[PDB]
């Protein structure tokens, strides 16, 4: 189930959130498939971090991205995992 996901709209939505929608809607629809499933929701967030790690070449941009990423389930109307390592 995890291998099948298209999290590119989440990566697009987050980096535009850092610069300062079509992708916020599409991102929440993708994340909705993991609602109230903590292990699988965490892997989705981790895979967004994994793909974006090379592109965050600065402490302040990295922390804002992490912060916005931790708030992404809540801002989509979903529960975040109790624990999810983003390092």
């Amino acid at each position, epitope marked *: 189930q995890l291998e099948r996901a298209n999290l590119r709209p989440c990566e697009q939505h987050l*980096m535009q959130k*850092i610069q300062r929608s079509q992708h916020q809607e599409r991102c929440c629809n993708e994340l909705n498939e993991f609602e109230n499933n903590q292990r699988c929701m965490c892997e989705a967030l981790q895979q967004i971090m994994e793909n*974006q790690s090379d*592109r*965050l*070449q600065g*402490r302040q941009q990295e922390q804002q991205f992490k912060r916005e990423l931790r708030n992404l389930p809540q801002q989509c109307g979903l529960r975040a995992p109790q624990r999810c390592d983003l390092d």
Partner: antibody, heavy 116, light 110 residues
Framework: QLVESGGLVVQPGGSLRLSCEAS????????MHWVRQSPQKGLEWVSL????????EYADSVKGRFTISRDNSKNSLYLQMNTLRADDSAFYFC???????????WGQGTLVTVSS | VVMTQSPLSLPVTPGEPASISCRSSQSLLHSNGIHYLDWYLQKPGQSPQLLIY???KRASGVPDRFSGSGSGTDFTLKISRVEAEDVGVYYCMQSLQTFTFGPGTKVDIK
């Protein structure tokens, strides 16, 4: 400000260490790269170090021979170059990443001559 | 990833418009929306300075007459009206796989 030290004539197969003193911005918030400029060859990218120093990535050309390091205490990006070679001769630039993988502020330059 | 540029030499009439093209061997579109392409001006005697970054966005000190466009592999740096301090080697650079600069275009004063 990115004052760049080190860089002298070296023999083939030798070692050299470069330093880069930072001024004008929070050094502990930005990835730092080394990029070199050859006389004949174009602009080559060298190595990488995150602001925390946690990650370090290297160009294929000069990988295993060069090791990159930062001292956030003294605000200095070091490049320890070993096994220097004629192909490694170039002007070496201390590049200041912009936070989103772009070279915002460049240094002035320091030359390295691999010659006998 | 290999970066090429056309023209290798672009003599300009000052005041007139000018363009440089850059092309990559593979698409420069990342999984986020960004096109990881910059432009860098190396003037005579000076180090390279940032003109345009991430495809369209321009730098703080770079005035508005520097434009940057493109999508996929082809990218174009347009200039509205050429001026004094706009002469040197114009490298493009990708930031996708690692960091690869183009050979550069010389901005002669014709």
């Amino acid at each position: 400000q990115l004052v760049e030290s080190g860089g002298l004539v070296v023999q083939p197969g030798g070692s050299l260490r470069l330093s880069c003193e930072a001024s004008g911005f929070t050094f502990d918030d930005y990835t730092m790269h080394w990029v070199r400029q050859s006389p004949q060859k174009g602009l080559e990218w060298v190595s990488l170090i995150r602001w925390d120093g946690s990650r370090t990535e290297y160009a294929d050309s000069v990988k295993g021979r060069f090791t990159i390091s930062r001292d956030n205490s003294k605000n200095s990006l070091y490049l320890q170059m070993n096994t220097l070679r004629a192909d490694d001769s170039a002007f070496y630039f201390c590049v200041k990443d912009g936070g989103l993988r772009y070279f915002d502020s460049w240094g002035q330059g320091t030359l390295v001559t691999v010659s006998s | 990833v290999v970066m090429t540029q056309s023209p290798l030499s672009l003599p300009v009439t000052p005041g007139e418009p000018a363009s440089i093209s850059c092309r990559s061997s593979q698409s420069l579109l990342h999984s986020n929306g960004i096109h990881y392409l910059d432009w860098y001006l190396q003037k005579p005697g000076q180090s390279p300075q940032l003109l345009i970054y991430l495809g369209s966005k321009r730098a703080s000190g770079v005035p508005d007459r520097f434009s940057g466009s493109g999508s996929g592999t082809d990218f174009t740096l347009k200039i509205s009206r050429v001026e004094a301090e706009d002469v040197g080697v114009y490298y493009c650079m990708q930031s996708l796989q690692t960091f690869t600069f183009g050979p550069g275009t010389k901005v002669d004063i014709k």
